[PDB]
């Protein structure tokens, strides 16, 4: 299928397995979700080059950008104030919060080995209480306004609007949860306040909303 947004961008994304929807592919919908954010107008392709090339890619003009973080930071930098908003985050660490969280969840859920299984698991949640500390945490903009604050009242990474370290980060987490909960009845802990509000928001936020695959296609990926 395909979806005109509003050319000159045009995303290639994998397709559902049926064919009627977006496929699963964090990167993917990271850069679908910015390329909404932005909102300027854009074609999305989904698709069921150069050696090794991979999906997503963006189309522009006729330049082909094959690589995620590229894509990313054209968009960013060729899409600015005033026409466009800069999506960049405003504090270092929404750039690294959770960073490790996708890979850690990777190795936990491909894991073979029995004996290593709570080890890797526990690998995963110390990653996710460090993501839900920063969550927590007053950010300064915050602290300017009440001094006294001691938790964060903050809607995402950096603050109430999503950024790209959003876009990079839910589509991700997103899979965490939705894997681990259902393949081995492991939701991110209700104990993460600050995880579980975050990913509560960006759920209420049509950006991500939108852009999320189905389900069934998340699963079909883990098996």
Sequence with gaps: LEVLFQTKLQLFVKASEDGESVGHCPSCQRLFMVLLLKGVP??????????????????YDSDAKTDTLQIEDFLEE????????????????SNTAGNDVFHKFSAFIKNPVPAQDEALYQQLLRALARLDSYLRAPLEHELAGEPQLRESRRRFLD????????????????????????????????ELRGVRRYLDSAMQEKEFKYTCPHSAEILAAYR
Excluded at 78 to 93: I, M, N, Q, V
Excluded at 178 to 185: E, L, S
Aim: proline share 14%; aromatic share 8%.
């Design 42 to 59: 854009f074609t999305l392709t989904t698709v069921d080059f150069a050696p090794g090339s991979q999906l997503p890619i963006l189309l």
């Design 159 to 190: 603050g109430d609007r999503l950024t790209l370290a959003d876009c990079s980060l839910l589509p991700k987490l997103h899979i965490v949860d939705t894997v681990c909960a259902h393949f081995r009845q492991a939701p991110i802990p209700a």
């Design 78 to 93: 060729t899409l600015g104030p005033p026409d466009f908003p800069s999506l960049a985050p405003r504090y270092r660490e």
